């Protein structure tokens, strides 16, 4: 299939979604997940290593298909969308950023049906927390990277990957520990973009992060354990429940 609606709200619905990787079909890593991501909101996904947070992010990118249940974007199954089209609407930034052998400007504009404008490129970098280091860099945005970011540190690579995701105006944004290496100032830009930017009403967000301050501001928090959601609610509700999240916050 290949759907390409002009506008896409970014409404994500996981409906009793279960999943087992192809190479270990006998073990469900995600079990009966049901939750919704709405435009203008942020959902934080927390839990121990191996609880399935990255796997959820992988399914939302349509890298794999649910073993059970359904996952809809604007009421339609992800596969019904033209892969290129879907790849634009849904953006994911991960722990290890994908860099190219082009220039920083080309790296941020990579994968666009429309060659951007330096003003737009710069704006994406300002919001991702990349602009700053790039500016104080001899040759700035024209600077060329030696594949895999030899000259770029970890944080600089993440900030750049995030810019590439932002300049597409995704209606669905996925942050999987995408800023674990960002400096203080860039981290504030990520917070501004998630909770203060006008752009937030045009996209839903799945947030996986170690920064408990960002988590606390989330509209919804889902605690993942052994592939299943054990707790769900705002920060206060979960703190009041004094359950898994509560135990996590106060370590
Ligand atoms: N490529 C893979 N093939 C088979 N099983 C995998 C694969 N990747 C992850 N898993 C299983 O899923 C679990 C982790 O899911 P993941 O989404 O990475 O967890 P988390 O992000 O919470 O640390 C692992 O413990 C492993 O058992
Ligand atoms: Mg992970």
């Amino acid at each position: 299939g290949l759907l390409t609606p002009l506008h896409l709200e970014g409404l994500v619905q996981f409906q009793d979604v279960s999943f087992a990787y192809p190479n270990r079909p006998d073990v469900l890593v995600l079990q009966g997940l049901t939750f919704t991501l709405r435009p203008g909101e942020v959902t934080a996904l927390v839990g121990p290593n191996g609880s399935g947070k990255s796997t959820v992010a992988a399914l939302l990118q349509n890298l794999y298909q649910p073993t059970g249940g359904q996952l809809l974007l604007d009421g339609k199954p992800l596969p019904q969308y033209e892969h290129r089209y879907l790849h634009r609407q849904v953006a994911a930034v991960g722990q290890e950023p994908q860099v190219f052998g082009r220039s920083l400007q080309e790296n941020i504009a990579y994968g666009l049906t429309q060659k951007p404008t330096m003003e737009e490129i710069t704006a994406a970098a300002v919001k991702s927390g990349a602009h700053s280091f790039i500016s104080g860099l001899p040759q700035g945005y024209d600077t060329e990277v030696d594949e895999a970011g030899s000259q770029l540190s970890g944080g600089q690579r993440q900030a750049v990957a995030l810019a590439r995701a932002l300049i597409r105006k995704p209606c669905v944004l996925i942050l999987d520990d995408a800023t674990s290496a960002l400096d203080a100032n860039s981290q504030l830009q990520v917070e501004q973009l998630l909770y203060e930017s006008p752009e937030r009403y045009s996209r839903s967000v799945l947030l996986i992060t170690q920064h408990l301050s960002l988590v606390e501001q989330a509209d919804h928090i889902l605690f993942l354990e052994g592939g299943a959601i054990r707790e769900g609610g705002t920060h206060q509700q979960l703190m009041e429940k004094k359950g898994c999240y509560w135990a996590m916050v106060q370590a």
Side-chain angles (χ1 to χ4, degrees):
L2 300 180
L3 297 169
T4 300
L6 186 67
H7 179 55
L8 215 64
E9 303 186 305
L11 178 71
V12 179
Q13 310 170 75
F14 272 69
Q15 311 184 318
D16 194 46
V17 167
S18 286
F19 180 79
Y21 282 83
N23 294 311
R24 195 185 178 207
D26 54 300
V27 179
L28 293 182
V29 289
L30 297 186
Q31 305 179 72
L33 301 172
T34 291
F35 63 96
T36 300
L37 303 175
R38 311 179 183 72
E41 292 182 43
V42 177
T43 286
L45 192 55
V46 304
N49 286 293
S51 57
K53 295 175 288 67
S54 297
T55 299
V56 171
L59 294 205
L60 185 47
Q61 294 171 61
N62 199 48
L63 292 178
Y64 302 100
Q65 301 299 301
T67 299
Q70 296 281 309
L71 175 37
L72 319 174
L73 169 56
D74 279 20
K76 303 177 182 178
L78 303 180
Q80 280 183 46
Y81 292 105
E82 190 275 302
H83 83 297
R84 286 175 300 179
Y85 174 68
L86 186 66
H87 191 287
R88 306 194 208 90
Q89 306 301 292
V90 186
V93 202
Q95 193 65 170
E96 201 72 319
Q98 172 192 54
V99 186
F100 315 91
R102 314 179 184 186
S103 68
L104 293 177
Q105 158 178 36
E106 301 172 66
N107 217 301
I108 297 176
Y110 183 88
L112 281 182
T113 59
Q114 293 295 314
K115 241 181 189 180
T117 294
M118 204 52 235
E119 276 70 51
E120 310 185 308
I121 293 180
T122 298
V126 171
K127 298 167 204 165
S128 70
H131 182 75
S132 182
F133 90 75
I134 294 182
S135 293
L137 193 80
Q139 294 307 327
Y141 288 73
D142 291 304
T143 301
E144 275 177 49
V145 187
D146 292 319
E147 193 58 54
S150 301
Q151 304 62 57
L152 300 180
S153 68
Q156 306 185 318
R157 215 173 306 126
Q158 298 188 305
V160 167
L162 177 48
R164 188 191 311 118
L166 294 180
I167 195 171
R168 302 169 176 177
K169 299 291 188 291
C171 62
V172 182
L173 179 66
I174 299 170
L175 304 182
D176 195 4
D177 284 323
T179 67
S180 50
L182 293 191
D183 69 318
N185 173 46
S186 297
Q187 186 68 256
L188 293 170
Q189 315 293 38
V190 165
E191 174 181 47
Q192 178 68 37
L193 184 74
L194 305 185
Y195 301 114
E196 303 298 304
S197 176
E199 284 171 38
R200 77 194 185 88
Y201 306 97
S202 66
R203 73 191 168 215
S204 57
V205 177
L206 177 68
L207 170 70
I208 298 162
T209 191
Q210 298 298 295
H211 313 313
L212 289 177
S213 58
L214 294 174
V215 174
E216 185 196 310
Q217 302 175 64
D219 302 272
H220 304 292
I221 301 175
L222 297 177
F223 187 102
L224 207 62
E225 195 198 299
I229 299 174
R230 312 292 183 146
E231 283 164 42
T234 58
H235 178 68
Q236 282 179 53
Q237 310 182 67
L238 294 176
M239 287 295 278
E240 288 167 48
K241 175 174 183 171
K242 299 181 180 183
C244 299
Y245 177 63
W246 176 80
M248 176 181 265
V249 178
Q250 308 174 306

